Amino acid sequence: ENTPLFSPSLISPDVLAVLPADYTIRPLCRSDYKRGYLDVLRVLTTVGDINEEQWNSRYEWIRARSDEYYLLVVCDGEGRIVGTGSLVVERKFIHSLGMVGHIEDIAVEKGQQGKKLGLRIIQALDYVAEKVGCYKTILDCSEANEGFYIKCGFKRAGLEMAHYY
Amino acid sequence: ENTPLFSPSLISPDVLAVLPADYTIRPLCRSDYKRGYLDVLRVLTTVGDINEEQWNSRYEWIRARSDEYYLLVVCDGEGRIVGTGSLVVERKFIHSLGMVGHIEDIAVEKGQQGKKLGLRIIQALDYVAEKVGCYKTILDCSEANEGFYIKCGFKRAGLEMAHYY
Ligand SMILES: CC(=O)SCCNC(=O)CCNC(=O)[C@H](O)C(C)(C)COP(=O)(O)OP(=O)(O)OC[C@H]1O[C@@H](n2cnc3c(N)ncnc32)[C@H](O)[C@@H]1OP(=O)(O)O
Ligand SMILES: CC(=O)SCCNC(=O)CCNC(=O)[C@H](O)C(C)(C)COP(=O)(O)OP(=O)(O)OC[C@H]1O[C@@H](n2cnc3c(N)ncnc32)[C@H](O)[C@@H]1OP(=O)(O)O
Ligand SMILES: OCCN(CCO)c1cc(Cl)c(-c2nnc[nH]2)c(Cl)c1
Ligand SMILES: O=P(O)(O)OC[C@H]1O[C@H](O)[C@H](O)[C@@H](O)[C@@H]1O
Ligand SMILES: O=P(O)(O)OC[C@H]1O[C@H](O)[C@H](O)[C@@H](O)[C@@H]1O
């Protein structure tokens, strides 16, 4: 299936305009399993082993929530996935039933790093978040990659704390 | 309506066992609008103005997702809400289609602070997260409240970064 996860109208036109020639940013679709999506996530952390039937199940759970999960991909000239980025919109009671944008799982293929593809992904995810009416966008990072997020216009706002099971 | 948001079986029995006499922790229900729920959230940040019809709409959106949004309350001997705590379970592709527990919007009524109610809320939310199969629980905090989260068993794991709109 080639049906976008969410509306292509949510993709930043200004970002599309300034990508390198023949590169694009678009919503995830189900067939992206075959276009090297999970490969790109291997630069981020352990993906483990995921067959197409498991893919299709998780894809459908997410599609049943395309009003929360905004997953998009960067594609090169040859339609290969070279970049990934997620926004998850949390609904709150606070801030007059406000909404918070959470940026997750930003990855660019090693051979493709250092070309602004990460920046375009963040600019696209910030465009989605503003447009669906989030009051702020937040994310968690390491010391080692804080400087990328500063170059994207993010500011330090507190501490991530964790409990492992 | 007095129907729990989620199954009371997800409430930590060990936490219920050690609360102060006549205090309880239970899932949110829709009638909690009248039991001072939003009052408690006033200690956390701006709630703004929220009528019962807006409450009912947001409550129903969340109930349509009680497999993601685990909101629970602490009640005193007189059935007043004195504490609130949220877990939101993110679905991932990474970690073999893993799940991450996000702790949000922890609040205890000022007159009721310093009695372990915050600790019981975190222990209850960590019980939910393990039980539905999260690989870790994370949250964002300030320097000023990092020491509460350390006493709860959390460790510093990175930086929260933010963009405001
Ligand atoms: C919320 C999260 O998901 S945090 C997890 C982030 N992901 C990872 O760490 C996975 C591994 N790394 C990557 O996949 C990528 O390198 C990313 C996404 C961090 C950055 O993407 P790239 O395409 O490599 O970066 P891009 O070229 O857009 O960088 C923008 C600017 O930041 C700089 N930059 C990139 N990474 C870093 C860094 N770690 N520290 C400081 N500066 C950096 C670039 O040099 C560029 O600088 P310029 O504007 O002065 O040219
Ligand atoms: C993920 C998030 O939501 S972060 C936002 C947190 N919420 C807020 O900041 C709102 C305002 N504060 C509150 O509502 C509450 O005070 C809470 C939730 C922070 C803590 O709840 P309380 O019921 O006050 O704390 P509780 O009594 O369970 O505290 C556990 C221990 O931590 C201590 N503690 C409580 N707050 C702090 C703090 N800010 N710094 C250091 N230690 C603290 C207590 O003294 C207690 O110590 P002990 O085990 O040595 O007795
Ligand atoms: O900054 C993103 C990390 N957080 C904050 C606390 O862990 C986060 C991430 C997601 Cl993806 C979510 C979320 N998950 N589903 C809906 N929203 C929430 Cl509440 C918080
Ligand atoms: O595999 P983990 O330990 O969860 O880390 C994987 C990544 O997930 C999230 O998107 C966080 O923003 C990153 O800080 C983290 O690098
Ligand atoms: O009103 P905000 O600026 O979003 O802050 C309100 C709270 O929301 C979240 O639960 C965060 O964990 C806290 O760090 C923050 O205090």
Numbering used by the authors:
A (entry chain A), B (entry chain A): 26 to 190
What do the study's own words say?
Gna1 (EC 2.3.1.4) is a member of the Gcn5-related N-acetyltransferase (GNAT) superfamily and is present in yeast such as Candida spp. (e.g. Candida albicans, Candida glabrata, and Candida auris) and Saccharomyces cerevisiae. Mechanistically, A. fumigatus (Af) Gna1 facilitates N-acetylation of GlcN-6P by promoting direct nucleophilic attack at the thioester carbonyl group of the acetyl coenzyme A (AcCoA) cofactor by the sugar-phosphate amino group. Previous work has shown that A. fumigatus Gna1 possesses a classic GNAT α/β-fold, forming an obligate homodimer. This dimer shows extensive secondary structure swapping with substrate and cofactor binding to the two active sites that are formed by channels on the surface of the enzyme, composed of amino acids from both AfGna1 monomers.
As an alternative approach to achieving AfGna1 inhibition, we aimed to exploit the protein tunnels that connect the dimer interface fragment binding pocket to the substrate-binding sites (distance of 1 to substrate-binding site = ∼8 Å). Extension of the fragment scaffold into the active sites by traversing these tunnels would effectively generate a competitive enzyme inhibitor by blocking substrate binding at both AfGna1 active sites (bifurcation approach). To test the ability of a bifurcated derivative of 1 to bind AfGna1, 3 was synthesized. This bifurcated fragment introduces an N,N-diethyl alcohol moiety into the scaffold and displays a binding affinity of the same order as fragment hit 1 (5 μm). An AfGna1–3 complex structure, which additionally contains Glc-6P, indicates that 3 is accessible to the fragment-binding site, despite narrow tunnels linking the fragment binding pocket to the enzyme active sites. Like fragment hit 1 and 2, the important binding interactions and binding mode are maintained in the AfGna1–3-(Glc-6P) complex structure. In addition, the hydroxy functionality of the N,N-diethyl alcohol moiety displaces His-127–coordinating water molecules and interacts with the acceptor nitrogen atoms of the His-127 side chains. The introduction of a para-anilino anchoring point for bifurcation leverages the sp2 character of the anilino-nitrogen, maintaining the planarity necessary at the branch point for correct N,N-diethyl alcohol orientation whereas ortho-dichloro substitution positions the fragment along the 2-fold crystallographic axis (with a positional shift of 0.6 Å and 19° reorientation from fragment hit 1). Moreover, the positioning of the Glc-6P 6.2 Å from the ethyl chain linker of 3, visible in the AfGna1–3-(Glc-6P) complex structure, is suggestive of fragment-linking approaches toward AfGna1 inhibition, albeit challenging because of the limited size of the tunnel. In line with this, derivative 3 did not show inhibition against AfGna1 in a recombinant enzyme assay, probably because of the inability of the N,N-diethyl alcohol moiety to extend into and block the enzyme active sites.
